[PDB]
Amino acid sequence: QPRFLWQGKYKCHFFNGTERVQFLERLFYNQEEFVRFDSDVGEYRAVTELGRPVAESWNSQKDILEDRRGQVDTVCRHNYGVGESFTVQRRVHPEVTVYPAHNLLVCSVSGFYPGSIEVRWFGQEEKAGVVSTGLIQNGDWTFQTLVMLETVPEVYTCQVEHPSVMSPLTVEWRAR
Amino acid sequence: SKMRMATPLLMQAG
Amino acid sequence: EEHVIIQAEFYLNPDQSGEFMFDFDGDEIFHVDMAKKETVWRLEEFGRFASFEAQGALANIAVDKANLEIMTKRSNYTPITNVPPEVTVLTNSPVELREPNVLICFIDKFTPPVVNVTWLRNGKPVTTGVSETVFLPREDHLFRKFHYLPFLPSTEDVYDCRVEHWGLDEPLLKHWEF
């Protein structure tokens, strides 16, 4: 059976809190973006042919433009204050463990928030040959990452720095 | 406390 | 770039299905259950610090339905080009024998936002303690979705996530073993 989809995306982009804020409205039909309101331009602009008379009608209305131009303050800046404490200011401790996976040493970092994290292998720290699976978003306000080490090979230590933990977390490893 | 939202615009007046 | 909040809403015909959610830096803050007229916080604690009137989201989706119906006419009833999902079965933490864990079925890069996801243990379907997210937004304007199965890892059990989509010629079944 035929399907028809509408998508509305109202994005509030914050650059250093509520100092620099942009509001971006993008409308989609069957996945294709046709029209958009960028606060930096202050008017609606067409993306495809369908959005041409759409942007034409809205831009010709002073009341529509003033409403869309004020979104940065009435919605964007207001919502930043409402959610600040439980989103921007959310801090959850990482859970660090070390295990081997041929030689390749793994440092498992789990359940942390926010995503910003420093993971270093150490006596002297090694910077070359420390492959990572990358930052993985679990979809539940936690992150997980695995930071490997192409070693041959001594005690190996994984050092983790995060905004939640005050002192750097460390986990040592030795084989038997 | 109250989360706000952007309202969609109507394309036509019916 | 410091923080991004996206209000993502959709309406789909002829299914007459709509969704409304808030996204903060790739994570869901809340969504509105259209059937229950209810604001559903991704973490329960969020509803203690903030509130959202679900009625506003339902009136937004009515406007989305009206605008979709106008846009469908203007395109001369042109339909969505279906994109099939790529699906992955994984755990949120390292798996330990007989240690409570959560299997996660990640259904990604698909459209329209309609799926039939089933969990099975040793073949038989399982609905015990299972949970799921709504249709979450992607930057390529396709959808992603998480399905969760709390489980006690064993060396004998076999798990599968079966996903049905219209872009798939055959229903996808991704296998998971300890």
Numbering used by the authors:
A (entry chain D): 4 to 104, 112 to 132, 135 to 165, 169 to 191
B (entry chain G): 6 to 19
C (entry chain C): 3 to 180
What does the literature reporting this entry say, word for word?
Presentation of antigenic peptides by major histocompatibility complex class II (MHC-II) proteins determines T helper cell reactivity. For MHC class II (MHC-II) molecules, which typically reside in late endosomal vesicles, the noncanonical HLA molecule HLA-DM (DM) acts as peptide exchange catalyst. Typically, DM encounters MHC-II in complex with a class II-associated invariant chain peptide (CLIP), the placeholder peptide derived from the invariant chain (CD74) that assists MHC-II proteins during folding. The MHC-II proteins HLA-DR, HLA-DQ and HLA-DP are heterodimers consisting of a highly polymorphic β-chain and an α-chain showing little (HLA-DQ and HLA-DP) or almost no (HLA-DR) polymorphism.
Here, we compare a set of MHC-II proteins consisting of the DRA1*01:01 chain and 12 different DRB1 allotypes in terms of their peptide exchange properties. Although these complexes cover a range of thermal stabilities between 64.1 °C (DRB1*07:01) and 87.3 °C (DRB1*01:02), they all show essentially the same three-dimensional fold. Thus, these CLIP-bound allotypes apparently occupy the stable ground-state structure with CLIP bound in the same canonical orientation and register. Although we see no significant differences in ground-state structure, we still expect polymorphisms to influence CLIP affinity and exchange, as they may alter the dynamic properties of the peptide binding groove. For all analyzed allotypes, CLIP was predicted to bind with its canonical core motif (MRMATPLLM). Interestingly, all allotypes retain the capability to sample the same conformational states MS3 and MS1, but CLIP affinity and pMHCII stability alter the occupancy of states of the individual allotypes.
